[PDB]
């Protein structure tokens, strides 16, 4: 998988990403444009203006992230609004559709916690998956898997903070709220899960709906959110946390979950069952993500035309004890690629600002 090392100012960071992933970003934009057009009757000109409005929000509220977005645009030779689109894709898509009309686990264990997910989506995006190592002086070094062009997704940092992301569809949109991928980046720049929690909350409200898990070797929490609800998931009596694509927590009376997939319930029940017979070993933990019960709608999801629109596109396993993330591209039953991410002393020097 394309691996880009980004360092320096926010703009320089964005620029390296944009330059080195130029052709991949073009594919990301193409795919996003197709997806977006499927959700709306609006003309492209109107869509451009909405994106200009969203860009102005990011510029005002998170100038550091906007500067990076500007760098990505410059390096990829694309319009800033196109990159803004990539970084607000879910929110943008949700909003347009309203106008018109993943399996994750954390296990606390004696020889170190284990945390992981499968990311399930349209297969077209798998070829657009890249990884970035981002060094910013005085902040944790981040290593994360993302679709080319997007500044926050799934990964971990030199401080041991590991993040996971699940689609969730509670109703509501706040265009001035924090986009999900910005919140992911905020979590990835934090030195602990507690700080991550604090800094996400600091934003004063989410733009839309998703689920985010943040953990290290000691503690972990999940967040189920809408623009009007932030509910915290904690470890159960077994030191476990499981999440799929539906609300497990009680939200306010006004909250409304929109068309979650039936298999989201099946997969959660399945993973909890699997973790019951789980012996604690890293080998067995890795095998959980290859489960094919209820195929093609399984934990290891398969694309099957006329049944399931997506597949598991990657799996990540955080070995908290060793601060290593094992990544398997494609379906864990037969991965396209497998590699281990780890921080070296240079990554650590940047984090210390030494
Ligand atoms: C296309 C997807 C793989 S993406 C969404 C969620 N991750 C899930 O499961 N789905 C599938 C769906 O919406 O059919």
UniProtKB/Swiss-Prot annotation:
Biological process according to GO: penicillin biosynthetic process
Regulation: induction: The transcription factor rfx1 controls penicillin biosynthesis through the regulation of the acvA, ipnA and aatA transcription.
Mod. after translation: The pre-AAT protein is synthesized as 40 kDa precursor which is then self-processed into an 11 kDa (protein A) and a 29 kDa (protein B). The B protein carries AAT activity.
Alphabetical list of Pfam families matching this protein: AAT
Record Gene3D superfamilies: 1.10.10.2120, Penicillin V Acylase, Chain A (3.60.60.10)
Pathway(s) annotated for this protein in UniProt: Antibiotic biosynthesis; penicillin G biosynthesis; penicillin G from L-alpha-aminoadipate and L-cysteine and L-valine: step 3/3
Molecular function terms from GO: isopenicillin-N N-acyltransferase activity
Known catalytic reactions: isopenicillin N + phenylacetyl-CoA + H2O = penicillin G + L-2-aminoadipate + CoA + H(+)
Keywords: Acyltransferase, Antibiotic biosynthesis, Peroxisome, Transferase, Zymogen
Assembly mode: The active form of the enzyme results from processing of the 40-kDa monomeric precursor to a heterodimer containing subunits of 11 and 29 kDa.
Family to which this protein belongs: Belongs to the peptidase C45 family.
Its job: Isopenicillin-N N-acyltransferase; part of the gene cluster that mediates the biosynthesis of penicillin, the world's most important antibiotic. AatA catalyzes the exchange of the alpha-aminoadipyl side chain of isopenicillin N for phenylacetic acid to yield penicillin. This step occurs in the peroxisomal matrix and the penM and paaT transporters are involved in the isopenicillin N and phenylacetic acid import into the peroxisome, respectively.
Protein name (Swiss-Prot/TrEMBL): Isopenicillin-N N-acyltransferase
Gene: aatA
């Amino acid at each position: 998988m394309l691996h880009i090392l980004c360092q320096g100012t926010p703009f320089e960071i964005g620029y390296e990403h944009g330059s080195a992933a130029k052709a991949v970003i073009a594919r990301s934009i193409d795919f996003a444009v197709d997806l977006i057009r499927g959700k709306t009757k609006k003309t492209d000109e109107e869509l451009k203006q909405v994106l200009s409005q969203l860009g102005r929000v990011i510029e005002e509220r998170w100038p550091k992230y906007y500067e990076e977005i500007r760098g990505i645009a410059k390096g990829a030779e694309r319009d800033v609004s196109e990159i803004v689109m990539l970084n607000t894709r879910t929110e943008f898509a949700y909003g347009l559709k309203a106008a018109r009309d993943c399996t994750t686990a954390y296990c606390q264990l004696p020889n170190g916690a284990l945390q992981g997910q499968n990311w399930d989506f349209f297969s077209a995006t798998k070829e657009n998956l890249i990884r970035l190592t981002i060094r910013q002086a005085g902040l944790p070094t981040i290593k994360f898997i993302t679709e080319a062009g997007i500044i926050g997704k799934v990964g971990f940092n030199s401080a041991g903070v590991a993040v996971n992301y699940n689609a969730l569809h509670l109703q509501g949109l706040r265009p001035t709220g924090v986009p999900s991928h910005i919140a992911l980046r905020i979590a990835l720049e934090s030195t602990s899960p507690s700080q991550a929690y604090d800094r996400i909350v600091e934003q004063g409200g989410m733009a839309a709906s998703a689920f985010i898990m943040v953990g290290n070797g000691h503690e972990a929490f999940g967040l189920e959110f809408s623009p009007t609800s932030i509910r915290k998931q904690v470890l159960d009596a077994n030191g476990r946390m499981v999440h799929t694509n539906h609300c497990l927590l009680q939200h306010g009376k006004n909250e409304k979950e929109l068309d979650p997939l039936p298999d989201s319930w099946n997969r959660h029940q399945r993973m909890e069952f699997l973790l019951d017979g789980f012996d604690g070993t890293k080998q067995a933990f890795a095998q959980l993500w290859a489960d094919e019960d209820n195929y093609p709608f399984s934990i290891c999801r398969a694309y099957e035309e006329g049944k399931s629109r997506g597949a598991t596109l990657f799996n990540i396993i955080y070995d908290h004890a060793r601060r290593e993330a094992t990544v398997r591209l494609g379906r864990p039953t037969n991965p396209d690629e497998m590699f281990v991410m780890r921080f070296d002393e240079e990554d650590e020097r940047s984090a210390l600002n030494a």
